[PDB]
Amino acid sequence: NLIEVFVDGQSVMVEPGTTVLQACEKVGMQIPRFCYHERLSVAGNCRMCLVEIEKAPKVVAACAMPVMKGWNILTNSEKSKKAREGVMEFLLANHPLDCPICDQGGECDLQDQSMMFGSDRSRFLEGKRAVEDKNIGPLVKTIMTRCIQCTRCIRFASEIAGVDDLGTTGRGNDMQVGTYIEKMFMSELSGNIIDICPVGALTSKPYAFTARPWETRKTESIDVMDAVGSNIVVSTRTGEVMRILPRMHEDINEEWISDKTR
């Protein structure tokens, strides 16, 4: 029972229950996101998915709003752009100036979305917050000061990994992600939180400081550690293998690889 909705005036037929963001994907528009991962559950905390629906006073989160018949999604209206700029400013208000030394630098969703949907200057005239780093294991190098509380790691650990050890402690601006205790996040799919993290809060310890994204040459290959046959991308620079990244194959491995493969 496909219903008709409009994205910037273009008719697109979507099944009922489709999120606004998914219809925008149907017409090709990629709504900016920070907390929404299609594999994971919807959370609606990034607030970057706030888009304006025609004749609706209040903007809605595309990731969490099911479409209604006859809705016109204005993805580039002034309200949508202003909401995106405000959310980006709030995200970058406390974020540390770690881009040159952050391993995520060059492949950071925060950086790119700031360059594309955010302001080019900062009005923040106060001190930034700092968070003590947590140790979650020998694989994931953690700098929580860079975290944006997107909650991707938590939801991933709960749903895909199945290990309910990562959670949010505190309230308000002092809210911190991570084990309240000195527990170590151990799982086969533990390394995938590095990939899932938009910011360089969670990064690969063996890969740390080794190379920058633009240098690397990407070669698409298949892993041999297991008989699953996960598709991987072998990132090589100057003839040396630098890291192994998952490659999407919905039938075999959705977007994940084992720790041994990684």
Partner 1 sequence: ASATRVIQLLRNWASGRDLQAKLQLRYQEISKRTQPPPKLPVGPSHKLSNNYYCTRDGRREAMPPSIVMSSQKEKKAVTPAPPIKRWELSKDQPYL
Partner 2 sequence: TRPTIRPRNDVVHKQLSAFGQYVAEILPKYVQQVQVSCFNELEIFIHPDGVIPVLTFLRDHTNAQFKSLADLTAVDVPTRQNRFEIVYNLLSLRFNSRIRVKTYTDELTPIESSVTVYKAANWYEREIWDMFGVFFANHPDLRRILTDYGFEGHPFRKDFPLSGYVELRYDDEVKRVVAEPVELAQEFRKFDLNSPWEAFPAYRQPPE
Partner 3 sequence: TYKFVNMREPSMDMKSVTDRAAQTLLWTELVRGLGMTLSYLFREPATINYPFEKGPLSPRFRGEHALRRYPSGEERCIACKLCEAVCPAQAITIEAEPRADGSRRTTRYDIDMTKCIYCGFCQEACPVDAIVEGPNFEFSTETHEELLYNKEKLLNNGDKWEAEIAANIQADYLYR
Tokens of 214: 């633009």
Here's the x/- map for partner 2, 16-35, by CB under 8 A: it reads as: ----------xxxxx-x---
The CA distance from 254 to 2, in Å, is 26
Partner residues linked to 113 by β-bridges: none
Cβ at position 102, least distance to ligand FES in Å: 21
Query: What does 63 interact with, of partner 2, partner 3, ligand FES, none (CB < 5 to 8 A by kind)?
Result: ligand FES
Among 17, 78, 171, 220, binds partner 1 (CB under 8 A): 78
Tokens of 148: 């944006």
Is residue 123 a contact residue for partner 1 (CB under 8 A)?
A: yes
The CA distance from 78 to 84, in Å, is 10
Closest of 261, 259, 255, 257 to residue 241, by C-alpha: 261
Closest of 38, 52, 107 to residue 255, by C-alpha: 38
Tell me the number of residues near partner 2 by CB under 8 A.
20
Is residue 63 a contact residue for ligand FES (CB under 6 A)?
A: yes
Piece of 78-86, 154-162, 211-219, 226-234 that binds partner 1 (CB under 8 A): 78-86
> Would you say how long the chain is, in residues?
262
Question: At what angle are helices 109-117 and 78-94 packed, to 10 degrees?
Answer: 140
The CA distance from 59 to 84, in Å, is 11
**Residue whose CB is less far from partner 2, 215 or 226:** 215
Query: What does 73 interact with, of partner 3, ligand SF4, partner 2, none (CB < 5 to 8 A by kind)?
Result: none
Residues that bind partner 3 (CB under 8 A): 99-101, 105, 208-212, 214-215
Binding residue numbers for [2Fe-2S] cluster:
34-36, 45-47, 49, 63
